Amino acid sequence: TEIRVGVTIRMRXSHXFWVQVXKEFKH
């Protein structure tokens, strides 16, 4: 507000979300 991640930055889940490049982000 953060997701900074693989692109993207804004938008997010209500209380959790998944994000990964291509390995692992798991969140």
Report d(CA 27, CA 10) in Å as an integer. Answer: 15
Report d(CA 27, CA 19) in Å as an integer. Answer: 8
Distances (CA, A) of 15 to 6, 8, 11, 22, 23: 21, 18, 12, 24, 22
Please give the method by which this entry was determined.
NMR
Report d(CA 23, CA 27) in Å as an integer. Answer: 13
Asked if residues 27 and 18 have their Cβ atoms less than 8 Å apart, the reply is yes
What is the DSSP secondary-structure string of the chain?
---------S---SS------------
Which of 18, 15, 14 is CA-nearest to residue 3?
18
Environment class of residue 12 by beta-carbon count within 10 Å: exposed (0-12), middle (13-18) or buried (19+)?
Answer: middle
Which amino acid is residue 6, in one-letter code? G
